[PDB]
Structures are given as C-alpha cells and as structure tokens.
C-alpha cells in the first residue's frame, strides 16, 4: 500500500501489457470491438454479441479487498459496447473491482499556533536577556541556551510540514505524479527530516541540564565555573547527536523509506525514544527532591504562618515548565500500544502543552522575573533625566 510501490507496480502492470502486447488475441469479423491497449488490460477487440469479461487487476489496493469482482462489458457488432455516444463513455462495471481523518486537521491547527506564540515570546525574551549587560550570568546563559533550543524546535517543526505538502498531494494537486517520486527519492528531503530528530532531542537535553544545574547549587559546593560551563554546553548540544546520527545511519542503511518519516521498525524508533525518556526521568527526579527542600524551609520557617497551602502551591506551578515535568505523565507508560481514543487523547494532551511550553518559560523566567524588571525601570528612569 504505497504510491511509490504502486507506481512501480503499474510500471510492472505496463510491463505486463508489454508482455501482453507480445501475445495479442485475434479480432472478430465485424467493424470493431475496440478494447485495444487500455490502462488495465492490453487485449485488442474480439468476438462481440457476448458478455466480454476480463479479470481484476492485482496492483489495485481497493481490488485486493475483493478479488471476486471484475469488469462487465457487452460488445456489439457496431464497433463498441453500449453507449449513447460514440467513443465517449462506454458500458463498464469497475465497481466490482474497486471497493475519515478529521482529527488530523484539528490537531494540526492547534500546535501550529502554540509553536508560533512560543517562538515569538522566546525571541523577545532572548533579545531582552542578551541586551542588558547587568544580567550576564551562568543561570541566564543556561536560560538563553534553552530559549535557543526552543527556537530551533519551532523552526524545524514549521519547515517539516512544508515538506509534506511538496512531496504529496500539494504537488499532486497538479499533473506531476513523477515529481513526487523524484523529490521523494532525492537526498534533499531525507536531510530535512533528519534535521528534526535533533532539535527535539536538543530541547529535551537542555531541559535536562537546566535541572541538573539547578540541582547542584543546593546539593553541594560548586567548583570551577569555567570548567562547569564547558561541560554543560557539550551535553546539551552534542549528546543528542550521539543517538540521532546513529538513527540516521540505521534509517539510511536499511529502511531507506520515505524521507525517514514512518516508524516502520519500532526497534529503530527506540534509538531515539530511549535517551529522551532517560532525560525526562532524570528531569522528573530533579523535580521531586527540590520540592521536598522547599517544603522543609517553609514548614520550618521559624514563626511559620500557616499558608504553606497557598504558598507552596505557587512554587510548583513555576517549576513545571522549566524542567518540563508535564511530559512524564502519558509518555512514560504507553507508546505503540494504544490503538483507541487513548492514542488520540495521548496525542492531544502532549502536542498542545509542549507547543505552548515555550511561551510560559518565556514569561515566568524573564518577563515577570522581578530582577529583569529592574533593568527596565532604572534605565527608563535613567533615560528620564534627559
């Protein structure tokens, strides 16, 4: 079941006609019965006054579901079958041979919006941080790298969707059946998708170094900051490659399918799914031992006004976007099993959130962060002395 597959099966069906042109049936004694060399069978004319019946094609997928059917045509001595017009629309019965994705449209309209909003907010945030001199620090360097990993994710997501149209019915909207296979059998489409399997992994691993960093400021004494940053920038931007490039090798060593977009072999998909899940699990662990500490400093806050219920509730919803804690909910359990609405729910509950994650990590950790607010007021007031 594949366009490419069936194009070559029609090249074989025309090779069949080439082999059938090699053995043609003799005509009858009349005007004609023009069946000549059609797009199905290649058998010329015949004896009319009979129910001329030729079997069903095999390359047709709609016909594999019903092999019992075939074509029904009653040739007559006049030269054709049964029609009101001459050589226009004949008597045929292909109904015997040839035997609803709404969600997709819905889903796609939602996340193409979250990612756009994120990208906008994140380029604004990154510009603000890179602007002021005062706030140049290790924490904000990590924040900028995480921002830049969300901007690289959005881009690839955008471009990838364009590719789908080009190699499918958007270019097949015209009469270029050939153009889709050439562009599909090229080496420029292949690159395009293998460029995505890296941006997603890099975003995941940068969320993972935002939590491992956060974790060592409390756990134990810090060391050479110079060395620390060099090791961190190597994990977030290069550990993805260590399992993305092997995945590209496997896809371009054996599978070699349509621009590496269909996870046919679920074992090769695990090459990417496993490190992502590892990063998500470490991020979730880093999120549970930081909330203990926060409740052990509020509950034990000397005088301690009992309000931990509305004070630590606002200190959990600010850590969720930074460490990407929402991914551990559905993804950790199911993956290639749910074949029901469960799958749809899973799909819907992740795409939606992840697309809008960037926007939130840009507000809470930059726009609303009071320190960044001091850059503005001071400068604004500075500028106000003229």
């Amino acid at each position: 079941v594949s366009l490419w597959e069936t194009v070559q099966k029609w090249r074989e069906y025309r090779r069949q006609c080439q082999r059938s042109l090699t053995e043609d049936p003799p005509p009858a004694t009349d005007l004609f019965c023009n069946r000549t060399f059609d797009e199905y069978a290649c058998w010329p004319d015949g004896e009319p006054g009979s129910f001329v019946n030729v079997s069903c094609p095999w390359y047709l997928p709609w016909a594999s579901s019903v092999p019992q059917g075939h074509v029904y045509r009653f040739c007559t001595a006049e030269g054709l079958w049964l029609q009101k017009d001459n050589s226009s629309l004949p008597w045929r019965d292909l109904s015997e041979c040839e035997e609803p994705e709404e969600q997709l449209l819905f889903l796609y309209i939602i996340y193409t919006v979250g990612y756009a909003l994120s990208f906008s907010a994140l380029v604004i945030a990154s510009a603000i941080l890179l602007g002021f001199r005062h706030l140049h620090c290790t924490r904000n360097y990590i924040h900028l790298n995480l921002f830049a990993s969300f901007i690289l994710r959005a881009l690839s997501v955008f471009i990838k969707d364009a590719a789908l149209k080009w190699m499918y019915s958007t270019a097949a909207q015209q009469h270029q059946w050939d153009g889709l296979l050439s562009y599909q059998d090229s080496l420029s489409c292949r690159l395009v998708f293998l460029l995505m399997q890296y941006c997603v992994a890099a975003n995941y691993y940068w969320l993972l170094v935002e939590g491992v960093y956060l974790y060592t400021l409390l756990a134990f004494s810090v060391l050479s900051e110079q060395w620390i940053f060099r090791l961190y920038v190597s994990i977030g931007w290069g550990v993805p490659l260590l399992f993305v490039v092997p995945w590209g090798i496997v896809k371009y060593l054996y599978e070699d399918e349509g621009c590496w977009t269909r996870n046919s072999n679920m074992n090769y998909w695990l090459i990417i799914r496993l490190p992502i899940l590892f990063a998500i699990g470490v991020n979730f662990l880093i999120f549970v031992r930081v909330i203990c500490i926060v409740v052990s400093k509020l509950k034990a806050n000397l005088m301690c006004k009992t309000d931990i219920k509305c004070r630590l509730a606002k200190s959990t919803l600010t850590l969720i976007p930074l460490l990407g804690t929402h991914e551990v909910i559905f993804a950790f359990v199911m993956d290639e099993h749910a074949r029901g609405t469960l799958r749809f729910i899973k799909l819907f509950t992740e795409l939606s959130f992840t697309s809008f994650q960037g926007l939130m990590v840009a507000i809470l950790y930059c726009f609303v962060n009071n320190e960044v607010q001091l850059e503005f007021r001071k400068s604004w007031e500075r500028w106000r002395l003229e």
Binding site: V7, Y108, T261, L351
Partner: peptide
Amino acid sequence: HSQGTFTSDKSEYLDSERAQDFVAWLEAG
C-alpha cells in the same frame, strides 16, 4: 516522541490516498 508519531500517522494515511487516486486516473480515467 509525540511529534514523530503525528508525522508518521499523517504520512501513512496521506500516502494511501494518493495511491487509489493514481488508480482512478488510469483505470477509471
């Protein structure tokens, strides 16, 4: 990772559509 799964899904349904249209452009066309 829920992004490659949407990509895969869209691709397999979409691909199939084009195949039967190829057929109706020949046999039925």
